[PDB]
Design an enzyme around this catalytic site. Structure first.
Site, mmCIF file in Angstrom:
data_model
loop_
_atom_site.group_PDB
_atom_site.id
_atom_site.type_symbol
_atom_site.label_atom_id
_atom_site.label_comp_id
_atom_site.label_asym_id
_atom_site.label_seq_id
_atom_site.Cartn_x
_atom_site.Cartn_y
_atom_site.Cartn_z
ATOM 1 N N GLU A 4 0.852 -1.097 -0.012
ATOM 2 C CA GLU A 4 -0.026 0.025 -0.079
ATOM 3 C C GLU A 4 1.040 1.313 -0.027
ATOM 4 O O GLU A 4 0.385 2.155 -0.632
ATOM 5 C CB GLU A 4 -0.816 0.009 1.285
ATOM 6 N N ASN A 6 -7.815 9.888 -5.259
ATOM 7 C CA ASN A 6 -8.612 8.844 -6.352
ATOM 8 C C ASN A 6 -9.435 9.966 -7.127
ATOM 9 O O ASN A 6 -10.482 10.370 -6.854
ATOM 10 C CB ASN A 6 -9.401 8.011 -5.657
ATOM 11 N N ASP A 14 -13.151 9.210 -8.015
ATOM 12 C CA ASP A 14 -14.360 9.609 -6.976
ATOM 13 C C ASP A 14 -14.177 10.695 -5.965
ATOM 14 O O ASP A 14 -14.897 10.688 -5.074
ATOM 15 C CB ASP A 14 -14.652 8.282 -6.360
ATOM 16 N N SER A 21 -11.893 10.693 -3.541
ATOM 17 C CA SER A 21 -11.675 10.373 -2.139
ATOM 18 C C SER A 21 -10.125 10.358 -2.249
ATOM 19 O O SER A 21 -9.387 10.475 -3.119
ATOM 20 C CB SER A 21 -12.044 8.923 -1.857
ATOM 21 N N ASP A 62 -6.693 8.367 -0.317
ATOM 22 C CA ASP A 62 -6.183 7.108 0.579
ATOM 23 C C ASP A 62 -4.853 7.674 1.503
ATOM 24 O O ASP A 62 -4.183 8.575 1.001
ATOM 25 C CB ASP A 62 -5.596 6.164 -0.348
ATOM 26 N N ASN A 70 -9.033 4.885 3.076
ATOM 27 C CA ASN A 70 -9.861 5.538 2.210
ATOM 28 C C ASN A 70 -10.748 6.472 2.906
ATOM 29 O O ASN A 70 -11.262 6.103 3.947
ATOM 30 C CB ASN A 70 -10.349 5.047 0.961
#
Length: 130
Positions: A35, A46, A49, A51, A53, A60
């Site tokens: 990750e 992102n 959308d 959002s 991380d 998220n």
């Protein structure tokens, strides 16, 4: 902070992650490795959308932490996403535990399915004394 492998393994063990909800320490190591490369300040937007991380586990903002700018999001971990960017990973670990309390468990992270699931992940904890 970018953790060294074994340093992170011992830190996670101390934080009670070994076997949490049936998930071995090596799986958590494999997750953080893919990750973020064990990087607590890592963020990933992102665009698709709106959002983001956050942190070592790349948690998220749509459901786990609040950053105020994600549309119709929730904050299950009851933390500002800023908390997921600290060198001290206690909050991030608390949040990761919350994530796996849900039905998907460790499967919540697609990178885990891609690079850890059904694999020999012993390599991540070897020599760390955990």
């Amino acid at each position: 902070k970018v953790f060294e492998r074994c340093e992170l393994a011992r830190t996670l063990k101390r934080l009670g992650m070994d076997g949490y909800r049936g998930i071995s320490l090596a799986n958590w190591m494999c997750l953080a490795k893919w990750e973020s490369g064990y990087n607590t300040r890592a963020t990933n937007y992102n665009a698709g959308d709106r959002s983001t991380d956050y942190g070592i586990f790349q948690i998220n903002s749509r459901y786990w932490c609040n950053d105020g700018k994600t549309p119709g999001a929730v904050n299950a971990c009851h933390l500002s996403c800023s908390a997921l960017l600290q060198d001290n990973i206690a909050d991030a670990v608390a949040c990761a535990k919350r994530v796996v309390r849900d039905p998907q468990g460790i499967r919540a992270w697609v990178a885990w399915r891609n690079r850890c699931q059904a694999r020999d992940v012993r390599q991540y904890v070897q020599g760390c004394g955990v």
